[PDB]
DNA sequence: CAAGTACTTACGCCTGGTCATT
RNA sequence: AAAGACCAGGC
């Protein structure tokens, strides 16, 4: 182990990947929520191109 | 370091001394209020119930101040502090404090701001001295500031999330200074251009144009309702311009009552034909132009921006010069109130019916645009066969660009003229353009006839791609559609290429707006800091901080610029 | 046609975009290959033989409405507007108010506005189907009248119907979250969530602590007003010093949800959400989908509002003067299409470049429903009952409420806190601070020739101060006022001393110069 | 937050008066009636009823400010007929007209229903 | 979010006409005919049912705080 | 300079009027005697304006000519602009 | 407050002579210590010299009656071992 | 015209074309405290300290900095009490 | 003082200074179970 | 901590070199409106300083057709330098050119 | 110098609409009657809500406001229910308010629609317009909503929940003969429902000696007061306001003179 | 006495959130 | 809680 890389929401490595709407709502995530933001210290961070 | 503290903005000399944050100042969103006089500011009860003004408890008003103290800080018309002579302050907010409510002469009571208190209203981009004007507080419900619409122009305000600052002078001396120096009525005429700053603007101007025709006849009840709103009315109902068959008044007849005193004025309405003055009907005016106000009665003419606006010789300017600041303030407020309450009856709108022309005018506009396109195609062909001689002073390419711009601008001008000439006399676009309230001829031309050439950097839409403006065009297409002519009008909707070209043009305008501000502000600061201390000494010589003579007489003649006005020499021109 | 046929059966056929691309139909073109590509805007008009312009097209565009981005695709009929108005709408749409995410109940986020009754536009763009704007609308359709009713809509302001706002128009909830964290910083220095008693904590405030429970946290449902304590907390001083969290000034909300957990470090962590129903008042900001923005000038009741022969009193009256100069015509055509769509029963199409939705077509469809073809309606004055001699343009337009509310912008200052260094009023509305009297303001006042007001603003209103200056040397002198022993070290002077009233900012300037070896002597002779 | 309570347009609080009569000194027998907590509903109908009276030379009403709740009615009558008399007669006439209209409408509803 | 009772512009109850609107649309009718069959003659009332988004169904999919 | 040879404007400038009104208003608020009779006015600014119109203000404006000399003009001598 | 309230008619700039700095300084021997406090209390000769000003927001300084509002802050001095340019 | 005239004079009065910039507003024979408010601050103050330059506090920025009544309008004159006119007339208190 | 767990929703009586731990759920987020005191909502 | 700090504070680089580091990248996802969330997730930022007075880098180039919204750009001194993607725009992820 | 004599004829009278024409009356009086329809007609509406449990996705103020707009049949007891401001008792009493109780907990898997049928009152006359049902909230399994409310008597000036009417359609001079609205192009405006002119002609000829009369109405109830009750109570309230104003004016004249 | 370099300045106000250091 | 930086935004 050498570190912890922040994982973008709804990326192939997020726990929200491939989940149906019912599963996400069971996880209290909005199925319409696009993803694409990291979570750092609780806040949601978006990396601008 | 020690140097960075003492530096420019956010430093010490400029961030804490030449400018500093102040007490007894509030701010909230401004919102229109045509009922308030020109010299009034609508202040919420929270701002008033927080901001305090200290009044010395004289024996004349020991009773009133004692009642205010008894109210406390909870009740709005109350007080917060009693400043006894020795400087000690007793606070009314915490506990009733029944033994500390005693008042004698020399104490101060920090009463909440009440109606009539003079305040300085500020809009932060303070460019001229008409941007910080003294208003009189009027307390109104809800939590927004409220200022009269004729005061919109001097502040450069507009009620779209706008905010203003309210500074409350605290001593009697500063209150008297603002009252005798920077009240709104005293600053009607700026010395910048010897013209009024405030004019009848927006709805009231449009309704004044509609209200001052020969068309408008008013019945008895409408006259009574309108005359209720004149603050300067003597109580006499004028005899109608139409009697027996049915007593009917006229719009000009009622406007004569608003006009203060015995004011004389001669103006020309916007749509005044050029040949009327030379021809007959000079004093008869079939189109009801040539506003003539004699003895304070509006004899004839339609009132628009050219008479009730911020131009030299306007009826408001003549009112300020002849009558005074107080009567001119009454004039502004009365115009707005009576004309708005008539507009309740008449009404005003804007809609699709005003942006659609007759099918004949659409045909004429399309034919003009197609003729211009054929002309520009002919010019392109002529330049491609090398039949265009290079105009002196310009190269061949610039000559061709000038020819294309001339053809397209001529087309836009003619199409706009046709669209303007096709507007119904009831058109709302035309009503607002002739009124001058908000609009321009080019706006009608674009919403009806043609949007026109779109320019970036002053030339046509540049060849961003390789010799083509967009991928949809062939290379070296200098035709009007390719290089930026938006043939379609706003109502007809713009095709995608025209949409992107309009995006480029509007973006150019936005960039100019956002990038000129720094340079202009810096220039203003340099100008002020160059002549901040230059003043007129008591020997009428203009001198700087070191008593160096700049001008022997101020402006070489010794007279302030608020009172001067344009006149004709009447001897310079005519022959021997 | 086969590709569209398989895509119409996208379900239970496993045909997707990737199959379309892998079949050689669509191709990705980057910016510098777009130079060597001749593009047809639409097929039906450019591919076909005519007076030929280009006979070598290499690609064609799916629909030219994809040039516009996410926030600009909500604009109905954007091709008719002036482009700067489209930019203003693009900026304004992000500030619109609505359901920002369907699970706002679980997320404890600061500055969460949730609208009450969002409505999906009746004049929609097809692109909006992919932005999920229909599923999470930000705005509501208002029967907008373009009329100059009582002058309270002049400039950019609007007149909002008090009865509509009464029945739930544009009502919103403002969830604000407060986060507090117990921590152990010193050896015996410990923070703890517990309700402070009247006399156990040396530091206290005049707030009311009665709303806190045993845990120092208010239970939800408690109606917390301004300055009331939310999360009771204190630090054991080396008896205790309170560090509980008050509310912002003048909020008057109700607690929604209070959460306890452990943070990363394992300490107790609390998050409290307070909701405040923000009914649209006459300071609030409202914007159309065309850059037509404005504050609610006044809130007339339904009887005061003008009415049609039917009884449709406009919810919002906007100024006719807003339109003509800025040439926003998507607003007008959108009102027309809203009227035609609400009457007909479908949701109209406002796709930018459609060439099959003209103004005249919409006008004819509107005339087919018993209305004026141009959208006008004969309106009756609510005060007097009379017909308004000019027919008012009334139509259902999508208006969106903005985050800019006057109760989040109104500030008043009268002798509040001062900075530690400058001893001038603090910066900001939250710090009870004061408005700034910048350089341009003082230049304006000098132009007025107003010396006393300028002095009051830059001396008395802000930091006033008194110093003692030696007369022999302008360097400030030691001044023990109670003992009255005014002594100036450096010349042994004890009698020739004068009192100077200067702003504290100037005292700091002089002392800062003295720390740079400059001696700013203040000689009064 | 500076919202007036909704009951500030019809409810009279402690101290202020429903109606006040002030003589206008500029012109003879012309008075000014200030009605508190009242709006166009009464002012317009009073003005219209007054204008029916041949002895009224001027009759008008206004709301000084929409945010406020107050009506000012200026009444100028012919001599030998006071503005107070004009106001009270016009109110009585409105009362009589509304009574007649209510009786006629009750007749109409009785006739329409099962009639 | 939930169907606005009491249409804003006029005041007619459109809060009980949403489930009937959904059933009518689901069964046969066009949107205009369903609105007529609910007696929403005025277009302001039609803007309530027609343009509503029933987010409360999306909200109800989430588990409650307490069972 | 002396009382004679007053070379300045006989008219009272707007700044002079503003500051004389402010100072007199503060004096009146500080229980100073009022030179003119008052018709039941309790606003010190209003009393000050009444005195100014009546030309009964006990104030002499000292106008400093740029050379350093000063001219003392009584408020009663100057002609009010308003 | 016994001294007259006299306005400033002139500001004469100049460079603080070392003798003027040593005489005006309220610290004797110069500031010779880097520690701000040593036992939780202001240390004489430290950067937070109790004679140099008023601290702890309630107290009064040694030099006068501070109250944290009356005291303007009195100057200290450091005796450099070897002189140094002024930038 | 008077505003343009005053600008053009405040440039071309000291005998040379004086740019409205740090070189010309901070070059004149004004005071250190007036120059110190325009783009140089510490530099002007350091020069004044070196050469012993004296600020007579005649301008406006100088008196604003010290919180004194600047010699602007309502500041260019000093009021005095008139002893004879206090007796004359009626005096109630 | 009773806290409702954020996952299992089974109310747990957790004393002060005890770690925030949901019994039988193993979840570290808990909630607060709105107070029994009653406030008045004017239906305006 | 390096990844965490760079994503949190926004200064792209090492903590010790904050001043020399690029700032304004990794902003906080604004969640006022859904359209705002989408616009923030699809945003491009020209690194040029916002204080530049040259108009050219802010103008809408012809080559933005279909790649960047011609309209969406924040007003103020950041106009034309903060841009938003068109609906169909896709950014290439990379492919080894073997 | 006297009042006119209005004559009213009713064209349509249904359970939710009265369409009547009033003749020989002035325009101001017709407009005032129309305004009293919207503004000054009393009705019983829920204006005190105390919520014991609310697990609904819609928060407490949301459901309180939804309750308030629920029309309650105040056909009879509104005249015999005193205002809370004028009642003797503090808070609420059976003569100044009507108590409602709601208590619904969703235990079934299918959603539970909390509707106006679940508002349990105590006065049999005041029932929330259920002789479909107005939807208050929707609940899933385990969610609960219980509340106790008091409904007071008010009019539409105070809040729109007491406004008895949906659209009051007021129209006069349908065939434009007084020229009160100058149609720009007359031919393109739809004929009114009450138009009495031929198809070919656009507007009636101008009538300079005319004045407005024959005012057409369409008073549409909200299920609270039947339309006839709305109009009768509106005339009653307007007359009461004028009678009270006359009482005050007579008092003022006697006090001054 | 020219050619080279470096230095200083670049609208006003206002709102919120976030973070690292104390 | 404090001033420092950054960010977004309003006119
Ligand atoms: Mg603006
Ligand atoms: Zn000394
Ligand atoms: Zn409706
Ligand atoms: Zn000291
Ligand atoms: Zn659990
Ligand atoms: Zn009771």
XYZ file of N, CA and C in Angstrom, chain B residues 56 58-61 105 129 172-173 175-177 179-181 186 325 537-539 541 543 547 562, chain F residues 8 13-18 21-23 25-26 29-31 42 44-45 49 63-66 82:
144
model
N -29.976 66.131 20.094
C -29.731 66.742 21.389
C -31.063 67.047 22.048
N -33.146 69.049 23.537
C -33.412 70.430 23.867
C -34.707 70.519 24.644
N -34.923 71.594 25.400
C -36.209 71.737 26.086
C -37.388 71.781 25.140
N -37.180 72.156 23.880
C -38.272 72.132 22.915
C -38.778 70.713 22.691
N -37.872 69.740 22.622
C -38.242 68.369 22.302
C -37.811 67.388 23.379
N -31.572 68.519 29.463
C -30.967 69.246 28.364
C -29.511 68.843 28.215
N -20.837 63.622 -9.519
C -21.400 64.037 -8.243
C -22.904 63.866 -8.178
N -25.841 67.571 13.058
C -26.684 68.584 12.442
C -25.943 69.301 11.326
N -24.635 69.503 11.494
C -23.861 70.221 10.490
C -23.807 69.451 9.179
N -25.859 67.101 8.194
C -27.211 67.059 7.659
C -27.528 68.332 6.898
N -27.176 69.481 7.468
C -27.422 70.736 6.774
C -26.578 70.837 5.517
N -25.367 70.294 5.558
C -24.500 70.312 4.385
C -25.113 69.523 3.239
N -28.260 68.763 2.947
C -29.551 69.350 2.614
C -29.401 70.569 1.723
N -28.373 71.367 1.947
C -28.163 72.567 1.162
C -27.215 72.363 -0.005
N -26.621 71.184 -0.147
C -25.649 70.976 -1.208
C -26.021 69.863 -2.169
N -31.583 70.043 -6.230
C -30.528 71.002 -6.526
C -29.570 70.488 -7.581
N -35.531 74.697 -8.060
C -35.355 73.271 -7.828
C -36.596 72.647 -7.202
N -10.711 80.104 -5.440
C -10.457 80.843 -4.221
C -11.360 82.066 -4.154
N -11.357 82.730 -3.001
C -12.290 83.827 -2.791
C -11.961 85.067 -3.607
N -10.822 85.108 -4.284
C -10.554 86.151 -5.258
C -10.926 85.729 -6.666
N -9.968 83.278 -8.471
C -8.869 82.715 -9.233
C -8.762 81.244 -8.878
N -6.944 77.955 -8.202
C -5.608 77.686 -7.705
C -5.504 76.276 -7.156
N -1.202 77.161 -4.067
C -1.607 78.514 -4.428
C -0.989 78.954 -5.750
N -23.545 75.100 -14.358
C -24.918 74.650 -14.205
C -25.904 75.617 -14.834
N -14.558 90.930 -2.440
C -15.037 89.562 -2.534
C -16.472 89.614 -3.026
N -22.238 82.191 -0.689
C -22.101 81.004 -1.509
C -22.893 79.849 -0.914
N -23.117 78.817 -1.728
C -23.904 77.691 -1.246
C -23.191 76.960 -0.118
N -21.864 76.893 -0.170
C -21.122 76.278 0.923
C -21.215 77.110 2.188
N -21.112 78.432 2.058
C -21.261 79.295 3.221
C -22.638 79.141 3.835
N -23.678 79.094 3.002
C -25.028 78.902 3.512
C -25.173 77.553 4.197
N -24.635 76.499 3.591
C -24.737 75.178 4.194
C -24.058 75.135 5.556
N -25.795 77.340 8.220
C -26.992 76.672 8.707
C -26.641 75.537 9.647
N -25.632 74.739 9.308
C -25.286 73.624 10.175
C -24.804 74.074 11.538
N -23.898 75.047 11.561
C -23.375 75.527 12.829
C -24.465 76.186 13.658
N -27.623 75.555 13.518
C -28.515 74.502 13.970
C -27.940 73.789 15.177
N -26.635 73.530 15.170
C -26.023 72.894 16.331
C -26.073 73.811 17.542
N -29.610 73.636 18.837
C -29.780 72.379 19.547
C -29.048 72.375 20.874
N -28.026 73.211 21.026
C -27.293 73.320 22.278
C -27.780 74.491 23.121
N -29.080 74.775 23.062
C -29.764 75.734 23.919
C -29.307 77.167 23.704
N -39.727 73.199 16.279
C -38.801 72.510 17.161
C -37.637 71.867 16.427
N -34.123 72.280 14.835
C -33.064 73.293 14.803
C -32.675 73.726 13.407
N -32.735 72.836 12.420
C -32.481 73.258 11.049
C -33.542 74.238 10.569
N -32.943 78.067 9.336
C -33.343 78.649 8.061
C -34.224 79.867 8.272
N -13.566 84.724 5.263
C -13.122 84.272 3.958
C -11.639 84.569 3.811
N -10.835 83.534 3.617
C -9.389 83.689 3.522
C -8.991 83.869 2.066
N -8.635 85.088 1.692
C -8.115 85.323 0.364
C -6.774 84.617 0.221
N -6.420 84.183 -0.987
C -5.295 83.252 -1.128
C -3.970 83.812 -0.670
N -30.944 81.987 -2.129
C -32.348 81.596 -2.163
C -33.246 82.741 -1.706
